[PDB]
Amino acid sequence: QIWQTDFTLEPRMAPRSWLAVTVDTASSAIVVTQHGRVTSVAAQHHWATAIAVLGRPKAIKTDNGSCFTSKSTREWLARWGIAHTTQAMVERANRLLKDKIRVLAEGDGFMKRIPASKQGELLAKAMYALNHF
Amino acid sequence: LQIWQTDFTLEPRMAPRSWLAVTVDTASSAIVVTQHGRVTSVAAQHHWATAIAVLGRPKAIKTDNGSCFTSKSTREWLARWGIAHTTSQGQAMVERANRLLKDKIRVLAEGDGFMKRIPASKQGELLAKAMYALNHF
Ligand SMILES: [Zn+2]
Ligand SMILES: [Zn+2]
Ligand SMILES: [Zn+2]
């Protein structure tokens, strides 16, 4: 598999409002996780989630953000045997995810921040809606 | 399918991220370890996603009653993954891995000249090398 990964902000999911999103380019499958800060660790724990869900890819493509080009991330991706190169599919995935998140939250009456106790199920439901799990 | 045991243990050499979450597969004795700054429900869930990535999905996970294992957020996560969960005794195999791992961490750090805290930029490769050495004796 060849994946594309990027981070995007979703303030309805605050305080853990940074979403890491990966898309598999051949299948269009999408995995998202939420994070309180954009760090190398956050990217690594997101990829371990995506691997657990979809299988281990041959290569991941990203932009040049510092979470993705750090010595830490470069070391992790070599340890896992995944090649790394430094858009349209991930951007499409972001918009579809944000839309689902907005309509589900506003439907439950949450017009601003979603309470932390409701976030885990609401993000899973948004993700499952865009997939064939 | 697989049955795991998981627990957290503190390792001050790996500070500030000195919380180690450890999972042992009961059939194969394989260990997966990740390190975390705080012991929270999310740290356990990201540890387990890592262990699924390395080992494959288990049928069941056994833990103690620490609050990050029995929280609503952890109960919901385990249910979404379809993993059964069983819970003040402890479990032998994970306590033994905790001991092996701390000994191993000490030996490796000390060979590289780190006598007390390991510099944060060294800790990822060293923890991975310790986990690999125990699995590949
Ligand atoms: Zn970006
Ligand atoms: Zn994490
Ligand atoms: Zn414990």
Residue numbers in the entry:
A (entry chain A): 59 to 144, 153 to 199
B (entry chain B): 58 to 144, 150 to 199
What did the paper state?
During the replicative cycle of retroviruses, the retrotranscribed viral DNA is integrated into the host chromosome by the viral integrase protein (IN). Retroviral IN consists of three domains: the zinc-binding N-terminal domain (NTD), the catalytic core domain (CCD) and the C-terminal domain (CTD). The central CCD contains an invariant D,D(35)E motif, which forms a catalytic triad with two sites that can coordinate various divalent cations (Mg(II), Mn(II), Zn(II), Cd(II), Ca(II)) although Mg(II) is the likely metal cofactor in vivo. Rous-associated virus type 1 (RAV-1) is a replication-competent alpharetrovirus, member of ASLV subgroup A; the INs of this retrovirus genus are a good model for HIV IN.
Herein, we have determined the crystal structure of the CCD of RAV-1 IN to 1.8 Å resolution. Crystals were obtained in the presence of Zn(II) and MES at pH 6.0. They belonged to the hexagonal space group P61 and contained two molecules in the asymmetric unit. The structure contains 271 amino acids in two monomers termed A and B, 186 water molecules, three Zn(II) ions and one MES molecule (left). The present A/B dimer buries three pairs of facing helices (α3A/α5B, α1A/α1B, α3B/α5A) in a new intermolecular interface, which can be obtained from the crystallographic dimer of RSV-A IN CCD by a 15 Å translation of one monomer along the other. Moreover, helices α1 of monomers A and B now run almost parallel to the non-crystallographic two-fold axis and are locked together via a buried Zn(II) that coordinates the imidazole rings of His103A and His103B (left). The area of the buried surface at the new CCD/CCD interface, 740 Å2 per monomer, is similar to that previously observed in RSV-A IN; that is, 750 Å2 per monomer. The novel dimeric interface buries a MES in a canal located between helix α5 of molecule A and helix α3 of molecule B (left). The carboxylate group of Asp64 is situated at the centre of the triad and interacts with Asp121 through a Zn(II) ion from the crystallization solution.
